[PDB]
Each structure stands twice: as structure tokens, then as C-alpha cells.
From a paper:
Deacetylase from the extremophile Pyrococcus chitonophagus has been analyzed by X-ray crystallography, small-angle X-ray scattering, differential scanning calorimetry, isothermal titration calorimetry and NMR to determine its structure, thermodynamics and enzymatic properties.
Orthorhombic crystals, Pch-Dac-anom, used for identifying the metal cation, have one hexamer in the asymmetric unit. The presence of Zn2+ in the crystal structure of Pch-Dac was confirmed by X-ray anomalous dispersion. Energy scan performed on the Pch-Dac-anom crystals revealed X-ray absorption profile characteristic of zinc, while anomalous density maps clearly identified the Zn2+ sites as peaks at the level of 18–25 r.m.s.d. In Pch-Dac and Pch-Dac-anom, there was no ligand in the substrate-binding sites and the coordination sphere of Zn2+ consists of the three conserved His-Asp-His residues and a single water molecule that occupies the same position as the carbonyl oxygen of the substrate’s N-acetyl group in the Pch-Dac-lig complex.
Author numbering:
A (entry chain E), C (entry chain D), E (entry chain A), F (entry chain C): 1 to 267
B (entry chain F), D (entry chain B): 2 to 267
The structure:
């Protein structure tokens, strides 16, 4: 009957609800395993640490992929990048335990030098095909005024990896050695300015801040004077829109809307 | 112009009198246009209705296809080389149904279209040879466009248009006897900020047949989702144009693609 | 506290005013030396030439960095790119004298071929660490409909250079030969469509246009017929928002807002 | 070793007692080998006779083909995608005639095989999965070799062998449950400094049939030149081996591919 | 026939003489048009200037392809690379007139930054397909102890261009706009240490040295003190092997011997 | 008088001895400061450790440049690359003290991923211009059967850096921040198969082996069973040619012979 619809608003509701079976009310329905893709050690916990704790509490398996080693993130002239990499691995392991996270994949690209290349797509696809996750969380590459190249590259690479994982001609040696081409059901953008889904983290906010603080190298007492207020202000910003004190915002869309969809921004 | 102190007046004066910019009939004196598609099918899905309307009015429409479409199957039994051959026949078939006779294949692999000087030169070489009056290309600023080939194609196409008239750009082209060429017209399809509309209500059924010609891409089960999707897109452009089904284009003066802070105000 | 606040609007005002000590009213307070980063010879003067004259008059040292040689910017079949590069160096030297500008750094990347690479980041960091400037002006890489690759690359590279200059592990050979990490106090985006700060250039507009016209290769009489009205229309656009006739618009944000800040666009 | 003061003595002692290097029977403990070919046909042209002799003695021989062979025709009617499909069937046919069952296709385009970390990882992934005892690869030091794919394949293959055993190299391979692997044997084919020879006089006619299986590459007119060429190569290795027709290999200890100034002395 | 040969030496003589019809005595039999590919302005004249004069005298059309602009080749702190490029264009034009050379193609890659890429192969193939030359002269990329990256890249790129020009699937847009595949009959390597063919240049040596000296920027009086003796010593080295005073050495092989030929070094 | 020589052998002797003033008998005459360029931590000491001790004993300043971090060089699954980098820095510092070496520059490129790029050339040129060394030692990039990409790249990059350091248009920002072009007097290739100069290390051989063994991560007891005999066999190979027990072999040529010299291999 779709041929004889003459109003956009009607066709849109019909496309989302009946054709795509898209659900914003409970979009995590049948997800048991999710990947969180972080550009740097700490990005997962700062972006969506509260939501990760809430997920592992409900018995959802949450696995980290860390794109970089975090080699550059110190102003101390006494800490070489190799020293800092070891330090931030221990820190992210510690931070991961406090939320329910057991498994981390390290790609080991150098901080500030994450290529936007076919090579990094293949590395991510290899992990998606092995772990066969139901959902993937990744930073929104369209975050206005995001100046960090690793953040822009990670978001775009992660969306490519999700879209190309189910194509048997993409990185075909993966299938030849016995991995299978996998479709992810769910995509969530964190660190986003246009969220359409909210998780209340008011009850776990104190644990989130403790798990951020586990990154001692990144949050000495002097830096923390600025960041505790910043992180609370972010949590309030998502909070206003969710009708709670403290929240984490996600943008969830159907796979289809990430390609040639001029009304994609209308959810 | 020295004596104007209000922006709104200077803006109307710049568009109307200085630039002589015309949204009412922007295809006035265009006889030949290039449609630049990242993949086989992108031209017909994006602006197939408009292409039929153009070739009917006797305008020559030439495709440039950036990639071979090697990756676009979930069938483990179709190699990329097999699929490339298949999608060439499909786009040839789809092209005949609209009035399109000439296709240039650059043969970059699907998902691996470089954003490089090299692909700019390939496009400039075609622009200088064919001397087209207008170029259609996908809007690289489409919100939430995740396909790298789509982003790269839009940016590369705008670069090619801007650099084709510069004799120092790809100078070997001139040494073997091509000439610099200036394009009159730029149109962005697959856009979320269109400012010009073509009614395709009368040709919508032909457009869908010409999309369906890409059998590899639209089996019956996929088509269950895509017919409604493509109709919903056509309705979205429709609402803004005051018809049922439309294709949206963004048209701006060449000048507004560079250091223009009010570019989004047309 | 900050724990006690449960309204976003309050936390936001508190974060800007008290935590970050951000001041839009006089943001150039303690800046004595600034770098202006231009993709092409002429971009500084066209973008913010009026502001540069006002700065050098008040005794602020303004230093240009030019990313490219301007090799491609002619339609004359008789002028090779090497010829035009020499010509536009003389032109930018001439244009620079008319405003108060004495020092220009030429990176000498070819027009239309400015890489977005670690290599160009190092080149810019080397200059920032040597000159120890208090502020940096650079083109807004998020300018809607900016099709020139050199403009997009320059803005992103400049923000990276500013962010990485203070990191001792970034381009470590710089410190080994006796340069020091440097933190830039001030970042200003010119050629922007979301300006939040304005400089009146009504009094110096005629000098700005003379200094643009000094680029003879780029502004013959026929081209100038279009560009004088264009440049006046731009100056009026910033003008309306500033409550003057002719202005230059800048976007100024705290350094923190260029990373994972979902309300960045809300100043 | 401390109290040796003559090079010639220390050299014999290093090879025989320390490294336990054996040129007389170097395939002692090899059950599985990879043959790495830049193009479809390179394995059979380079060492087809040796491959037949190996599979007859029950050794598993697995091909890795780096490229699709997209460029290797002067026929204006055959697109590269068409030719790729054709040369896959041809190499499958040629592979059956020798004892070869498994081919891995990397699907890099002919003439565009990068010398990159990315292609190293692709090869390491296969070496770690298949755990082969030996690897055959084209000698990248072949004088006057003009083909970039041949130079890149040889260097990449030696890198892959050297880096496969390092757990920090392509660490995601181990995280998903592959293991580091050390290859026991390295053989260079298409070499001008061979130190080991296989008699192929008895299987020469089968080798030529298996080369000819690549019809796209060896029409009757091309074959007029190549049968004599391939015979002349086989005679060149022959003279040095004391038979009519041979295939020459260079075998060295893994150690001699790094900072060994007397490497050329075996 | 060839099946019943049991001697390498016999099959080798038979392959060269009868099958390949290879002729070292007069290898320039049917060549009317040749390309000389030089990495830098001056490389053609220094390498084979004498041979070029002897060729243009006999009415052979000799066309230069210059890969780079020669931007880096001065120790003078006052001469920008753009200045030097203009200067070395005039110099090579002057040097070219003195030998019989009328047409030079400038690719305009920067000195020291000549990529070994598909892109430069396409540029060279485009010229080979347009000019349809019978022969190509290029520097021997296997020259022992050649440290200049532009020299190594030029030799390899030139051999690739020759090998790929006849393949319709290589740079297919060239054919779509109406160029045709072209097969080059003749390949000569200059600047080679394993030459197998010699041209007597004793009678034109003084003109060669004048045409080298035309590159004033490259050969001031002090540099020339070293280079006149060097260039004479090179000419004597080729001379001894040719049985004359002064010669230019070339390596000529069948096209076949540049691919999987283990006895290639045996001519 | 060079015009009226008619024999190569005579011109060759005359060019080396009188024109170039090339001296193999005492080639380190006026060198007080040398750079040793090593691809990996340990390459300097394994290649020419004995010669380094003999140089620092005579009061010559020897400065290391290490291209890579040595991240990949372990088969232990429990040592991350970041851990191993820290470990091999301490090891090379220890090994350096035992020979007379005080100063090491770390470029910090990852083991196995040393680019052959303009970027690494600039890094090396920056150090050559700052330290103004009289000589440079680097691994022979033409070593037959060298399979390590870092070894091939280091040798070529080092020769480029030496050749481009004196060109003011190469890496021009170096001069703008106050470094000067520098000419290196001396180039020595170690890890070479065609040496023409030898240093007796018989008396310091057991110190060299101790300084190699300082790299504990690289030489456990089991690995050392193979390498002590290997390193002794190498030292004997150079030994035979020098008429001593244990030696280190170097190739020294005039700078001129690294460009378009067909008789380069004839010294
Ligand atoms: Zn981060
Ligand atoms: Zn597409
Ligand atoms: Zn035209
Ligand atoms: Zn500009
Ligand atoms: Zn400072
Ligand atoms: Zn091949
Ligand atoms: Zn194993
Ligand atoms: Zn040169
Ligand atoms: Zn032809
Ligand atoms: Zn004089
Ligand atoms: Zn090493
Ligand atoms: Zn100096």
C-alpha cells in the first residue's frame, strides 16, 4: 500500500515502525555481547562508563577495543611514551574491572598517528568477525569542534568496519582461515551532541568518577579541579533532556540511515 | 556598493546583479552534463528521475563511475571480479532506460577510493576532454554519510571542477593537447539542504524499474525495504517542492564553495 | 561542591566563568605575540587583515605562517607555477608591510597538495615551540561548504599543532636539540560562520582592500569587479552581528571545548 | 669457538655444527610448504616441476597468490575484472595438474601490490594459521627484475617469515587465537645464484602443459617465444646441476638474511 | 627442434639470435623517435649528451622527459627553490638547443620528493602513448652505490611505464579519451656500470662539456675543477671497453630479460 | 692537463689522489665528532662496537642516533612492545657507557615500521645540522641478502640526510629557527660485504662481546650459543682481509662516488 502514501510524516512512521522494526524504547532488547571502541585508554569510561556498569550488572558481556597506546598524553618530561603506554594499560585494566569489563583488545597504533586506512578497517573487522557482537558503541565522528584526529578517525573507521564485516569480498583472507562474515544488529554513538536515547547514571555517577580517576597519569589532583566539574556538567546536559540529574546520551539509528538518507537527522 | 550599510541589501545585490545567480531556471544554456557516481547505481538512485527529464529535453548526460562496485554482495559464491562484470552490464542496462549513452569507468576498487591528487587528475582529464556545461556530484556534507567512497567522491568532484581551469594543474594534460575548461553549473544530489526541486511523480515508476535493473543489489527480499525507503526519500523532497515525489538538488554560485560564511543562507 | 548543582544552565555558567575563567569581552588581554596561519598567500589579509592592522598598531607582534607556495592560482597559460610562487612571495611581503607584519615562515608545500600528515604537524609545532606565541589564528575547518582541501587541512593541522606543542613525547627531537614544549593561551578561528567575537574594521577597511589588492596576480581589474562587493558583503555580515558597518568575525572557545564537549556549539 | 683464528675453519664449523645447515637433503622434516607467487602462473613457471615432485612424495603444497592478474592482456575487449575470473580458473586448472589443492587469493590488483605493513600482516596471518614447515618465494635480488610486484613479493615474503614468530607483530592475530609460528625452511626461486637443484627432465612435459593451462597468457604466437625461453632457463639450471633440465633454488640459514657479510659465500 | 638441445650455451645463442632477433651491432636500426628520461635537469646531457647530438645529427627526433624541477640543487641561501626551478628550465632549454632537442615534457615533481607511485607511471604512460616513440633511454636503477632516490625511482618508473603502456587495462581513461596502447621497440640504460654497447663521442666531447656547462647554477668554476676530470674519467672508462678515447656506455637487452631471466647478466 | 690523458687506469689514479685527495691510509684524519646511525638498539655495538671503543679512547666524540624503539624484538608472549622498548633503552644506555658513548638521540619510529619518507630524512638532517659532525657511520644499504626493511631504509635515509643537510632549500624551517646547513667530511658504511678499510679489534673483542651481551633481552644464554660463534666468525672474515685475527670492515668512498659513478665498485 506504500505506493499510495502522499504524506512524508506517515511514510516515515510506517518505514521506522513496520518496515525496519526500529525501537528507541528498548534498543538493547536482544543484545548479549557489545564492543566499546575507544580511541584512547579512558575514552570508554569518560564517554559511557555509567552505561557500561549498568550493562554488565544486567549480565551483558562488554568488550573494549582500544585503537591507540595513549603514548602522548603527559606533560611530564620524565615519562617516555613507552613508559606511559605500560602505565595506561594497567590503568585501563583497573578502570575496566570496576565496571564489569574483562576483555580488552589493544590495536597498539600510536596516539596522534591513528591512520584513516583500509589497514585499520581490516584490524577492526577481524575482531568483529571473531567476537560476533550484537552491538557496537563508537564515538560520533560528527561531534562539532572535535579537533583530535584519533577521535574523528575512530568514529569513521568503526562505522566502516560494521558496514564491511558482512561483505565476504572485504578482507577475504579472514574467511579463508575460517572466520565468518558477521552483521551487527545495533550501533550506538557516544560523545555525541545529537543524542536520541538516554541512560540514567545518577545512582552509579560516584563509581564512574572513581573509574575515571583510576587513570592517575591523566587525572592528577590539579587537572581533576577542572575535569570533575566538566564531567558533571556533561552529565547534567544529557540529564536535562532525559528528565534526571545525571545521564549519558547515545545516538541510535537504523543501519540504513548511515547511507544516502537526507532525513537521518530527523530522529 | 561602498555606500551600503545593511547586509540583507548587499546580499540580494551580490546574488542578483553581481553574480547573476538564477535558482528559477539554473540549467538555462546547459547542453552537456557529467553525473559523478561513487558506485554503479548511485546516479539512478540519487537523481535517475531528473536524468530521464534531462535526456528527454535533449541534454547529453555522461556518467563517471569512480569504483567497480566489487564489494556490494553478501553472497560467498560471487568473487568481486565476477560482481564488477555483473554491475557493469547492470549500469549499462539502467543507463539505456534513462537517456544515457556514455559511461567512464575509473576502476578504483569499491571501499578503496583514495582522496588523492591522482583521482583529481583522472576527473580533470575527463572534464577537459568532454568540456561539460554542468556537473552533478554527491553532497560530501550529507549528515551521517558513513561510506568513505561517497565522502571522497563529493570532495574530489568539487576539487576537479575548481582545478580544471588552472593551466598549472596536471600540466601534461595541456602538453598532449587538452585545454583548461570552466564548468558553468554545479549541482549536489543526495543532499539534506536542497534549494531546487524536480517533480519526478510522472517518471517515478521508470526510476524504480531502472534501479531494479541492478539485480545484484536489489533481490526481492532487499527490495521489500528499499522500495518504501526510496519512496520515503522522494516524499521528503516532495513536501519541500509542493508535489508527491521529487529529487532535491543544492545549487550555489562557484564562489560560495570557498570562504563564504553565509553560504548556507541560500 | 558542583555535586549539589542539578541544573545544566547553572553548571555551564559556573564552568565558563569560575573553572575555565573564559572571557569573550577582552579575550586578547595578555597576548603580545600571535601566529596567523594561512593556507595560501593572501588568506591572512582577506580573512582578518583589518584585525592584523589594529593588532600591530597596538604593538602586538603578528607573525605569518604560510602553508603553501600558491603555485596553482593563475589561469594564464604563460606563467609556470614556479614563476607564480616567486610573484606571490613578493606580493605577500608587500601586503604584509602595509599591515604591521615583518616575519613570514614559508612551509613551501605545493598549492592543492597540502598533506594532512604527522609531517606538517611537526613543521608547525617546531615554529610554535621556537616563537612561543601567546595566541594562534587559523581558518575554521568546519566552515560549511569549504571545498578547498588546503583550507580544511590547515585548520585541522593548526588545532593539532596547538594541542601537541606542549607534549614532550610529540616530535621529541625538537626538545633534544633544545626547543621547549609551549602552551598557547589563545585560539581564534577566522573565515568562520559561527563567530562569537567581533572587531570593528570600518576605519581600516580601505587599507585592508589596498593590502588585498597588493596580490595583483590574484586580483586583476575584472576579478576585482566581483570580489570588492563580495568582501564588503562578508564585512557587513559580521557587521550586523557586531552592531557596526564593517567587522571581522572570530570564533573563540576554551581549549577544553575542542575535545569531547557536546555543548561546544552553545557559546 | 673462542680459540679459532682462521675464517675458513670457523665458517665450516658455524654451518655444520652450530647451525646444523644441510644442503644435501634440506627438505628432511618438511610435510607442508607455502609457494608465494606475485601473479597467477608464477609458481608453475618458476618451480612447477619441483611442485609436482613434492606433491608426488606426499608433501602438501599451498599457493598464496598476491595479485588478481588484472593487467596481463593486450586484448582491448577483455576488462581486468573479466581477465581476473579467467586467470583464477586457469590457476585452479594448472594447480590440479601439479598436486595443489589450496590457493589463498590476497586480491591486490596486478601492478599495484603495495610494499606495506598491511600486506605483511595478510601473509603473517596465513603463515600462523597454516603453520607451514617451509616457504618458497621469488628472489627479490634477481638482477634486472623490472616488475614491481616481483620485487615487493620477495621482500614481503621474507618479512612475513621473519615477523611471524614475534608475538608483538600483528598482536590482534594472537588475541583472536592464532599462535606465533617459526618456518624451518626458506627457498628462493626465480634466482640467478642457486645453490640447490631439482632434476625436472622427467616432468618437463607436464610443467609445460601446466604453464599452457594459462591460455590467456600463452596463445600460440606468444608460446613460439616462451617454449624456447622456458627450455633455455631449465638448461641454465641444468648445466649447474649436471642434468638436462632443472629448477634452481637458493637455500640459506634464516640467520644469513640479516647482517651477514659472507651470506654470498654459500 | 629446440626440444632436442642438451647444451645451455647453444640454446642461449639460438634464443638471442633466432627467436628474439637481438642485435647489439646496430640496435638503433628502426628508431626515428626516442624519449630520454632524466630525473633532474642536466641528467640527459651528463649521461648521454654526446649520443643525443650524434642522434639528432642523423635526423632522429629526441624528446626529453624531466621528472623533477631541480628545486633543491643549490648551496646559495639567497635562491629559493622556485627561483632555482625557473633558472634550471632556462638552462636545460639552452643545453637542449645545443644538442638537437626541441621538445621537453616537465612532470614538475619536486627534487628529492619523486614518488615511486602508480600516479607517476600514469604520467609517463600518457606521454609514451601520445608520442609513440620507437625507443626510450632511462638511468639504470641497478647502478651500484646510487644514493639519489630520484635516480632509483626514475629508472624503475620508466621500465614500468614501457612495460604497462601496451596494456589497455592500465590507465584505461587514456584510451577512453582517444590515446592508443603503444609498444616501445628499444630500451637503453645510461649511467650504467654493466654496459654492452658503446657510442664514440670523442669528436663531440667538447660540445657535450659546453652543453653541461650551460647549467651554470650546477657548474660554477670551483665545482667544474672536480667535474671536468670526473666526466672525462667516466668517458675514458666506457672508452677502454669500446676501443676509443671517449665513449658513452649503454645496456641494451631484449624486453623479455627484464623479467624472471636468471641469465640476464650473461649479455 | 686532464683532457690529454688517453688511459682510464691513469685518469682514475689521478682523479682519486690529486683531484679528490682521497686517503684510505688515514681517512679519519681531522674527525673529532662522528654520528653512528643504528636501525635498532644494539646495531651500532654489533656492527662497529670495537671501532667505537677505539674512537672514544682517542678522545673522538661518538653520538648514537637510534631510528627505532626495538618494540618487536622478543619471542616472549608476556613482554608487550612498550615494556620491551623501555628495557632496550636502559640496555643501550648501559652498552653505550661501556664504549665511550654519552649522547643518544631516539627517533622512536616503531621497529619493522621505519618509513622511507621525506619526514625521517628531515629528522636526521635536523640532528646533522645541530651537532655539525665531521663524519657519519651508517649501515651499507647494498648488503647482499639483507631482509630487514629497517636496515635497508636506515642506510638509504642516512645517505640522503648527509647529501641534503648542506642544501638550504631542504627543510627550510630548520634555517628559519636558526640551524645552518652543514657538510659532513666523512661517510663510513658498516655491516658491509665490500669493505676497503679495517680496524683491528683483537685487543677489545672481549669488551665488544660484553657490551653486546648488555642487551640481555636480545641475548639470553640459549640465543648466545649461536651468536658468540657468529660474531667471532664475522670478526674473522674482516680479519683475514686486514691480516689480523679479529677486525671490523668499513667501506669509505668519496662523496662524489655515491652519484652516477660507473667505476664506484673499483675502490
Ligand atoms: Zn581520546
Ligand atoms: Zn554508493
Ligand atoms: Zn572549454
Ligand atoms: Zn586560500
Ligand atoms: Zn612557553
Ligand atoms: Zn609475475
Ligand atoms: Zn607453530
Ligand atoms: Zn640527477
Ligand atoms: Zn603504437
Ligand atoms: Zn672561468
Ligand atoms: Zn638491527
Ligand atoms: Zn656546519
Amino acid at each position: 500500500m506504500f505506493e499510495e502514501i502522499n504524506d512524508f510524516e506517515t511514510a516515515f512512521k510506517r518505514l521506522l515502525n513496520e518496515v525496519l522494526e526500529f525501537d528507541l524504547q528498548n534498543p538493547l532488547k536482544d543484545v548479549k555481547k557489545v564492543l566499546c571502541i575507544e580511541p584512547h585508554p579512558d575514552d570508554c569510561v569518560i564517554g559511557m562508563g555509567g552505561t557500561i556498569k549498568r550493562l554488565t550488572d544486567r549480565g551483558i558481556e562488554v568488550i573494549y577495543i582500544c585503537m591507540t597506546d595513549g603514548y602522548m598524553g603527559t606533560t611530564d618530561e620524565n615519562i617516555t611514551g613507552h613508559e606511559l603506554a605500560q602505565i595506561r594499560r594497567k590503568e585501563e585494566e583497573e578502570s575496566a574491572k570496576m565496571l564489569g569489563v574483562k576483555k580488552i583488545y589493544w590495536l597498539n597504533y600510536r596516539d596522534t598517528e591513528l591512520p584513516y586506512s583500509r589497514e585499520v578497517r581490516k584490524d577492526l573487522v577481524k575482531i568483529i568477525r571473531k567476537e560476533k557482537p550484537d552491538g557496537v558503541f563508537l564515538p560520533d565522528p560528527w561531534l562539532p569542534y572535535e579537533a583530535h584526529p584519533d577521535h574523528r578517525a575512530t568514529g569513521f573507521l568503526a562505522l566502516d568496519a560494521v558496514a564491511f564485516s558482512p561483505l565476504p569480498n572485504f578482507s577475504n583472507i579472514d574467511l579463508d582461515i575460517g572466520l565468518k562474515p558477521h552483521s551487527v544488529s545495533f550501533i550506538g554513538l557516544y560523545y555525541t551532541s545529537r543524542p536520541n536515547y538516554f541512560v540514567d547514571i545518577t545512582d552509579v555517577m560516584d563509581l564512574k568518577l572513581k573509574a575515571i580517576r583510576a587513570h592517575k597519569s591523566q587525572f592528577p589532583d590539579d587537572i581533576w579541579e577542572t575535569w570533575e566539574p566538566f564531567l558533571r556538567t556533561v552529565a547534567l546536559y544529557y540529564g536535562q533532556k532525559a528528565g534526571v540529574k545525571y545521564a549519558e546520551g547515545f545516538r541510535i539509528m537504523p543501519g540504513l540511515f548511515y547511507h544516502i538518507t537526507p532525513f537521518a537527522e530527523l530522529i
